[PDB]
Paper text:
In siphophage T5, the unique RBP is located at the extremity of a central fiber. FhuA, an outer membrane E. coli iron-ferrichrome transporter, is the bacterial receptor recognized by T5 (25). We present the structures of T5 tail tip, determined by cryo–electron microscopy before and after interaction with its E. coli receptor, FhuA, reconstituted into nanodisc. These structures bring out the important conformational changes undergone by T5 tail tip upon infection, which include bending of T5 central fiber on the side of the tail tip, tail anchoring to the membrane, tail tube opening, and formation of a transmembrane channel.
(C) Cryo-EM structure of T5 upper tail tip at 3.5-Å resolution. After two TTPpb6 trimeric rings, the tube continues with a p140 trimer and then a DTPpb9 hexamer. A BHPpb3 trimer closes the tube and forms the beginning of the central fiber that continues with a pb4 trimer. A long linker runs along the protein down to the tip of the cone, inserted between two neighboring BHPpb3 subunits and contributing to the stability of the closed tube. BHPpb3 C terminus forms the beginning of the central fiber with two fibronectin domains (FNIII), further stabilizing the closed tube and giving BHPpb3 the shape of a trophy cup. BHPpb3 results from a tail tube domain duplication/fusion, as TTPpb6. TMPpb2 density is very ill-defined along the tail tube, probably due to a poor interaction network between the predicted coiled-coil of TMPpb2* and the wall of the tube, except in the BHPpb3 cup. There, we could model TMPpb2C 35 C-terminal residues. Three TMPpb2C copies are coiled in a superhelix, burying hydrophobic residues in its center, interacting closely with BHPpb3 plug.
Author numbering:
A (entry chain a), E (entry chain Z), F (entry chain Y): 1 to 204
B (entry chain G), D (entry chain I): 1 to 298
C (entry chain S), G (entry chain R): 2 to 140
H (entry chain Q): 1 to 140
């Protein structure tokens, strides 16, 4: 399920993201030895945290947003969040004729584009596999012919089976709405709803 | 080339698909501008001197019109558009604001050679006129969200203001007892709306224009200036004590603003000739404030 | 942005003139504008210097087009020192207001052209303006 | 005794051990003052009426000079002292501020009978001139730290301003295309320094004078006023849209301020004759702003 | 690896420290005796701490910056930084022909330039040995011809082996991030990432 | 070692003390009985606490101050702090011909000036012995001929051996810099250093 | 040429004149202060001074040009003391009321040229302006 | 700064031998701030003169008796004796400065340094110029 944004629903301009906050949550156990050497240990997973802020909402905008959020809380679905700043179209073509060799469980994807894709991905962009919902950021990219060497920040959450297909454009965060236990919005005497905030967390 | 003279202009207000060309216009003032985000990124590496300024929004325009009273009473539509309810030729101030958002309309400022400036998403935010010993004129104040330059436009050939109404001396009454020694009766009506800025990250690299607004309050007010006159020693009718509720009417031959119950506060100035000044607002439970528009022969 | 085709050329007396045009194709879709240069294939430039815009005006001189480094887009427009002398001969005796060395010599414009690259003669004017002779002292 | 007339004065700026007597001075304004610490110690014992005021610092002076353009171009040293880099007779606005502290110099205001006021630790903080239909003149603004009265002084017999330059109409260009209907081109340059107050407990019972300062930023700005003129219907060259980057030059017969790339914001006023107003600042990556000083014959 | 900055990437002037806080962190066993005497014992190693604050970052500059930071977090190496206020090139020349006699421990150090270096390193400047990555701070200087006597605030971590070469320019701190666990970036409606800051900490 | 002040170093006017804070630290065990009588017990010593605040510092002023502070932290010396408000010269002459009878361990010094000193010390001034670094404040002074009766706030930290010589002028606080464990200063984009504070404690 | 880069030379009376240039191309896109001194091998600059800015003017003096350092980029434009004396003799006498030391002598230009085998004429004007004489008394 | 840099004014005091002390020093600022070294003034002769007006026919009222006190260290001295000062005071304009009545205009002056040497670099520069003023006195 998609969170309402002024792409799908421009008739409600108040539903735009006044300010997004992409939080990097990678819990680690960091210990500082007296000999000046700082040591880290990583066990848990990394999850992208998204915080959405909203302006004053008119009754119709709030009605639409609240209906969507209550539909989410009813069906127990997953809110999809689209960040416009990450929607630069660089890689274009078909992602079905590209092959990803299997057995890749590290933090690096080696894929043979088979010359079917034009353009090259840029470092810091958003990358995602077609068979897993986790979202990756490209930290480095080296192309030697048709084989690409894409480096990702989160260690690969799945081991490639050889059937996965890279996804570069149209990437959505399969988030789950936090702070929904006590979710409310105050209605002022002037008819507009205020104090609406969405603390979302990537529940892959 | 083509210069643009204010005297050679025509202001047409577009509402409901009909053009209200407001002739008998004494003077109007308007301006257009843009909003910038100018930051200077001085760093320890490079203490730069060149700012990073991008134009991202249109500053809302503030258009003010001064319109003479006319025999066809097109100018009462400004009260109609500002939120007053209509019955016949009289405009009521409703007890509660009807809708959250004001009545939006577009406005053109026509000029020769197909030149025009197109103000959009406008609303009437202020209307005040002074009944005095000079010809009455109501200064309306509208706020726009988006301004633009267009080639073809809407021109109100038929809907236009007639001849200006002849001057007639103002008079203020309590029920039917005249209030002596009037100087200047000034009436003020407002629709204090507020723009709802919804500039978001989807508008980056684009120019944003305000589109929606909500009404904070409506009100009717009047400031009356008299000369301090007393007819008796220890008079009860004319004094400086406040009046919690009293029926007042500021009447003319062509207009009459009625306060069914008024809250009057008085202020005395020890000037060359002593002057008292009233501050008339309707009470809490007062009936709707009346504004009658008489063209001719009442 | 908009249009800036109008630029005035100040050529020097007794000195040969040569201008180096780095043709370019900037696009502002992405915030760092693309620096892609146009590729100069099937391109020819033509330019004449003619006193005044009225019809029948005498041709003071003619630009000599040079196309070099087609891959990166650059190109050169030039004219020999003899052409410079011919231009300076017919220049008006009245001097420019801001510089008492320049004299109006005529008008000019260069026109790009594609000759049947797709069976189309897509020729459009590149730039325009006035040509000013700057009086020398060396000779 | 000896009175002090402004018309009978001579202003000499002392830099690098040489006196720059700035003749062709239309008018100057200056003031001196002291800072006090006045506290009233009213107590339950004695509700006193007499304050405890001690003079402990000299308030920095703000001297403003209005200097006519001259044929020897001594006035360009104000740009030179304010931080601009020099090549020939043209002054560049550097990409980054060169030094943390401004260029400090002393200034004398001479008068008859060995009377003088000595401003020390001065820096040029503002320079702006309006190219208009009147004779151009640049008002410089310098701030002093310490002022004093001295008997002998420095008088610039040789270094002096020549004859004032004849008037010449301004003209603003884009590349080489003139911009029509100019009204008044006003240029502004600043070195927005700030005094670093270091008054400490070792200065108790002494008068403190500011000595050191640091440059917050330098900038070059210009406000251009035009008449709203359009040559075509739906014109592209002349309109109200912002221009992110465009080469601009405000040219005269004796001076030419060049913006290699400019950020222009437009503002329309619906006055008697419509006027548009530009707001020209250099862009982020623009080349250094040029200021050429042509004495005669360019 | 190298932290991006306007020196390495001049095309991104938004990078570059708006304000840098170089803190001194020497843990000590301080004890306040009842007689008024304060006794402190130095046991734990000292480490410089660097707090970097960034100005308004545009989306592309932040993309480059967080791409580099995520590559840091991925490959797990150290993150070098170059403080620009200490980049005053006060010592010209090539330091390969400069010998530091072996067997030296403590704050004092003796090095022989053999008539190669030009320029005097004044007090307050940085100093770093070629082999060890520790960064010292010159507190006093005294030279007798070619031989230079330099006093450093932190005692020499390793005793000179006779091959360590002085590094008076281009000194990089081998640091580790301390904000990695929860590192969020907010995007405004103006189009800039605001309040980006780093709490670095020298490792070893 | 002397802390840089605009007496020795007037070329750096930013090194002046914008505000000093002479803190009286005399820990006591105070108990309030229910019968309204408040009772105190004193065991530990009294130490003068000095807090120094600084204005914005230019690069050269900060360079000098930081070099001095790092020299202090390197040699482990004792910072000497001079307070201008306590430098009123009342007692003048030779302090070598004055004799202090031994065995004085209370809170009062009886000394025979032997007529070699002119002037008289004023109550509230600073007094110090020549053989101990602790600084005393004169709370009372009665002169009966040549013998002086100086009363001091801190109880005499030493028992007079008969060789001590009173010191009235040129008195310095043998302080030790506290808060040096985490000592730093942020450099702003305008080139000036800000946020410098010295919390000093009298380590006799 | 460089119309915006006009500079007026000032020559002292009774003193041999000397002015040195530095041809040193730059490319700061990679990093600030990336400047490479231009090779001046087989370059020969030359110039002249004439009384008026028009044809038929009487020549006043010709600069004794030189190339001080080849491949280092340091060229020199200069003239001996006798030529300065001739300039002072030929200079006008309309002394300014507030700059009584400077008199106008004429206008000047200098042209750099390439005389390389395997190349053609590459004349280019690099200086432009006026020559002002500063009066002297110590002889 | 075409000529503004090398021009200063001298005020010789009447009835006193006037002596000005000069210190040449090669200051390097473009490469790096705060770097200056003296000029080796060996073979760098000095000469100056004073004249009443700038016309072709002008009177040589005086002439500085320049001397190089230190060959190295770039220290030189231009001075004139009491007789020259008296001649200047006698041959000076009677119009007094209003802002300083003791000063009257005497004439113009220049200083040329001639670095004649064995090496073919016999260059000459005008290092000083301006106006000469006489300050009247009464102690005689």
């Amino acid at each position: 399920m998609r969170l309402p944004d002024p792409y799908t629903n421009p008739e409600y301009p108040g539903l735009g993201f006044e300010s997004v906050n992409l939080v990097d949550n990678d819990p680690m156990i960091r210990d500082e030895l007296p000999n000046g050497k700082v040591k880290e240990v990583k066990i848990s997973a990394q999850y992208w945290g998204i915080n959405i802020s909203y302006p004053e909402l008119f009754p119709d905008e709030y009605a639409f947003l609240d209906s969507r959020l209550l539909e989410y809380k009813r069906t127990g679905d997953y809110l999809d969040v689209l960040l416009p700043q990450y929607e630069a179209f660089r890689v274009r073509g078909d992602t079905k004729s590209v092959t990803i060799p299997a057995g890749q469980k590290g933090s690096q994807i080696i894929l043979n584009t088979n010359g079917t894709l034009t353009g090259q991905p840029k470092a810091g962009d958003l990358f995602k596999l077609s068979t897993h919902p986790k979202v990756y950021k490209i930290t480095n990219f080296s192309s030697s012919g048709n084989v690409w060497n894409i480096s990702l920040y989160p260690d690969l959450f799945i081991t490639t089976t050889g059937s996965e297909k890279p996804v570069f454009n149209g990437i959505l965060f399969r988030t789950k709405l936090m702070n929904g236990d006590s979710f409310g919005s105050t209605l002022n005497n002037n008819g507009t709803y205020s104090g609406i905030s969405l603390s979302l967390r990537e529940s892959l | 080339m083509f210069y643009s003279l204010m005297r050679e202009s025509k202001i047409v207000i577009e509402y409901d698909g009909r053009g209200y060309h407001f002739d008998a216009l004494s003077n109007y003032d308007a301006s257009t501008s843009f909003q910038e985000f100018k930051t200077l990124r001085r760093t320890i590496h490079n203490r730069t001197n060149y700012a990073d300024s991008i134009i991202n929004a249109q500053d809302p325009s503030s258009i003010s019109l001064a319109i003479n009273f006319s025999t066809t009473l097109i100018e009462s539509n400004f009260f109609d558009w500002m939120g007053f309810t209509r019955e016949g030729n009289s405009l009521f101030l409703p007890r509660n604001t009807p809708n959250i958002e004001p009545i939006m309309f577009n406005m053109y400022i026509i000029n020769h050679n197909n030149s025009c400036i197109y103000f959009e998403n406008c609303y009437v935010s202020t209307v005040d006129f002074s009944l005095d010993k000079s010809i009455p004129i109501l200064n309306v104040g509208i706020e726009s969200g988006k301004f633009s330059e267009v080639s073809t436009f809407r021109d109100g050939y038929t809907i236009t203001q007639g001849e200006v109404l002849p001057y007639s001396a103002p008079a203020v009454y309590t029920n039917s007892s005249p209030l002596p020694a009037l100087i200047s009766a000034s009436m003020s009506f407002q629709q204090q709306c507020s723009w709802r800025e919804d500039r978001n990250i989807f508008d980056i690299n684009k120019i944003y224009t305000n589109k929606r607004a909500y009404v904070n309050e409506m009100n009717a007010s009047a400031t009356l200036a008299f000369y301090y006159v007393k007819r008796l020693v220890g008079d009860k009718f004319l004094n400086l004590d406040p009046e919690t509720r009293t029926p007042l009417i500021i009447k003319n031959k062509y207009v009459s603003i009625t306060f069914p119950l008024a809250r009057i506060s008085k202020r005395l100035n020890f000037s060359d000739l002593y002057q008292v000044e009233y501050d008339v607002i309707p009470t809490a439970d007062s009936d709707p404030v009346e504004i009658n528009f008489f063209g001719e022969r009442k | 942005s908009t249009e800036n085709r109008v630029i005035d050329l100040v050529v020097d007396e007794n000195v040969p003139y040569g201008l180096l045009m780095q043709f370019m194709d900037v696009d502002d879709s992405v915030y760092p504008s693309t620096s892609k240069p146009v590729d100069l294939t099937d391109f020819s430039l033509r330019g004449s210097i003619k006193s005044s815009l009225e019809d029948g005006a005498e041709t003071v001189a003619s630009f000599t087009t040079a196309i070099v480094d087609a891959a990166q887009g650059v190109a050169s427009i030039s004219l020999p020192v003899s052409a410079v002398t011919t231009i300076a001969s017919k220049a008006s005796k009245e001097r420019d207001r801001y510089n008492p060395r320049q004299r109006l010599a005529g008008y000019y414009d260069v026109i790009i052209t594609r000759t049947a690259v797709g069976s189309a003669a897509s020729s459009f004017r590149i730039m325009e303006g006035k040509v000013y002779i700057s009086d020398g002292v060396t000779q």
